[PDB]
Amino acid sequence: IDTAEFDALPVGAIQVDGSGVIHRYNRTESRLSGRIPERVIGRNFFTEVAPCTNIPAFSGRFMDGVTSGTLDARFDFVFDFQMAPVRVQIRMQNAGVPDRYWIFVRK
Template sequence: MNQTVHFSDLNLLDWLEKQTNEQLEDAPFGVVRMSRDGIVVAYCKSESHITGISKEYAVGKYYFTQIAPCANNQMVAAKYAQPTLDEELDYILTYVSEPTKVRLRLLKSPESRYQYFLVNRKA
């Protein structure tokens, strides 16, 4: 990774869009890169560490039903219907792992190629 990037950076979406799937592997927080229709394109090692789901299993699947059904709700998944999305919220992931307190960041814009589900583990 060429530069230090932070979870709450204002320009994080621009930075994410410039990274290859391989470059995203070194992000200091979990990154799920999805196609505009919710199919996982990249599932980074930080995300695998938090959830216990491997990149090999996740890539190519619909994120909100096949990978993270615990986020398939009005609080998270439904927000991706908006054309522009940049929201942070506290959440508890519960699908395949022990309940884990996290900070989520949901990102997309009309110009972005992808949409993003970012996870930062809380202390």
């Protein structure tokens, strides 16, 4: 996975670094969130863009994965947007490039 195929994925896909800063953000995720990729890239996913994820079930799982070198998690979650609660399944894992990590979002 590491362009037009990337924005056409059936699942949402976000690439972050070890401190949480967004490097890649696809269109499928933009469609599920309402966020434009250009103002979101360069900002921190956990502290700025998606604060609802700043709990031990999500950001804690991310922090532990980075600190142990291997990020590998699969869990159910619910995104608390302005309109209504959107139930999703999250898949977190490492990338082919060092210091880079992936967050996959489905449904």
